[PDB]
């Protein structure tokens, strides 16, 4: 700037010290914070965090928490806690099934789960995604294709 130049300086040099540097922003630390990425380059960060399912229809508050908690979801796939948070944009946590609620030794299929999801914000559609959105959390052969839903 003007101060950077020596004290004996013209008004021409004093103006050029504000112009000839011409500083620029460096938005490089914001590329790896998902809560501070811009919306135009957000699916670049979703690839390297291995975000398995993604929709270009969510709000920005619903897009950044799906990337920030992508570590915790894949860290403990089997545990119920990750299942609670994989349904993040659909605000829904009602009930989870277990063995002893059914008395005759489980269903044939060794108790595949029929989870409960409740959505009041959106009523149109939202059914045909939930059988494949929960597919990545589901193991390959520990669970079967039986499913239950609720609107």
């Amino acid at each position: 700037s003007s101060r950077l130049l020596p004290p004996n300086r013209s008004s021409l040099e004093r103006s050029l010290g504000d112009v000839l540097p011409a500083e620029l922003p460096v938005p490089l630390r914001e590329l790896h914070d998902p809560a501070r990425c811009e919306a135009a380059l957000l699916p670049y960060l979703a690839w390297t965090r291995s975000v398995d399912r993604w929709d270009p229809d969510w709000s920005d508050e619903a897009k950044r928490n799906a990337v920030a908690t992508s570590f915790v979801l894949h860290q403990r796939k089997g545990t119920l806690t990750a299942l609670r948070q994989v349904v993040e944009p659909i605000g829904a946590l009602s009930e989870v099934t277990e063995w002893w609620q059914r008395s005759p030794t489980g269903v044939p299929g060794t108790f595949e789960i029929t989870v409960d999801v409740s959505d009041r914000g959106i009523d149109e559609g939202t059914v045909l995604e939930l059988e494949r959105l929960l597919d990545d959390v589901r193991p390959v052969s520990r669970h079967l294709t039986r499913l239950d839903l609720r609107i």
Binding site: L16, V19, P139
Partner: protein, 291 residues
């Protein structure tokens, strides 16, 4: 597993050309010199200073963009994934390293690009030891003489059907190479779950392609015909890398090179389907010119 480093470049800072940077500096200069600007002030030495300054942040908007490429896994080059893979527990290993059989012919070799990045992509798919869909995949890529894996389950539960495919040549993988996945999956699976290991789980049908391309009257037809297989012979080996389908359009677009005005296809009458279970193999091709 899809390579992201084959897209158009993202711009983190905008990349203006030389002219609109120059007039943007002049406008700021006039405001600073307001009340003092004269025709004499915009002399030839002063202007050539401002033509430098319009060029220096032309090399700084190019500096921020070229730095932001090599930080993201999209368009990162060699000797720089070691800083990124350390953040994803990825260390490069030795595939026949520098043993000097004879001392002047040194033969040093590491893992190349575009497959070590894939392991970094699968780094988060190796955390869960409770066996999701990709942990059986992402641990089976530890070997070298194979290709990637796909998981499915038709029968009764806790019976995993994994299809161990392998690219080394004509189809059938050896059964001694098949035993290495149980050495790579011993304390990574779940203990009650039990997998069956089928190398070819649907069958192999022989495929070909016959294309009658046209080139322009012009440059040499030897290097332009051969450039079609430069994007094709590595493309066929990447089809069962994801276990997915080939199309008629895959037999068109992988043959369009510089000097093509139309192409043609005769080998399928209708397109075939290849699911995550179903796969096939391509025996031998013959792509010539019609001219």
């Amino acid at each position: 597993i899809i390579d992201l480093s084959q897209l158009p470049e993202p711009e983190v800072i905008e990349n203006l050309d030389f002219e609109t940077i120059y007039q943007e500096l002049l406008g700021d200069f006039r405001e600073a010199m307001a009340g003092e600007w004269t025709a004499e002030v915009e002399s030839d030495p002063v202007l050539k200073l401002l033509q430098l300054a319009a060029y220096r942040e032309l090399l700084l908007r190019a500096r921020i963009n070229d730095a932001a490429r090599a930080v993201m896994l999209a368009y990162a080059s060699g000797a720089d994934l070691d800083q990124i893979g350390a953040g994803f527990n990825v260390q490069r290993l030795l595939i026949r390293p520098a043993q000097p059989e004879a001392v002047p012919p040194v033969e040093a070799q590491y893992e190349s690009d575009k497959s070590l990045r894939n392991r970094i992509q699968l780094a988060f798919e190796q955390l869960s030891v409770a066996g999701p869909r990709n942990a059986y995949i992402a641990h089976a890529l530890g070997a070298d003489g194979r290709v990637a894996d796909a998981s499915a389950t038709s029968p009764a539960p806790c019976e995993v059907l994994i299809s161990v495919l392998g690219v080394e040549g004509n189809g059938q993988a050896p059964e001694a190479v098949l035993q290495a996945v149980r050495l790579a999956l011993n304390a990574e699976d779940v203990r009650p779950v039990a997998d069956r290991v089928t190398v070819r789980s649907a069958g192999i049908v022989p495929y070909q392609v016959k294309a009658q391309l046209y080139l322009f009257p012009g440059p040499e037809a030897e290097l332009i015909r051969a450039a079609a297989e430069a994007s094709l012979r590595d493309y066929i080996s990447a089809q069962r890398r994801l276990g997915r389908d080939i199309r008629r359009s895959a037999l068109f677009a992988t043959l369009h090179v510089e000097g093509v005005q139309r192409v043609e296809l005769q080998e399928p009458a209708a397109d075939v389907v290849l699911d995550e279970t179903q796969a096939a193999y391509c025996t031998g091709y013959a792509i010539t010119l019609g001219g």
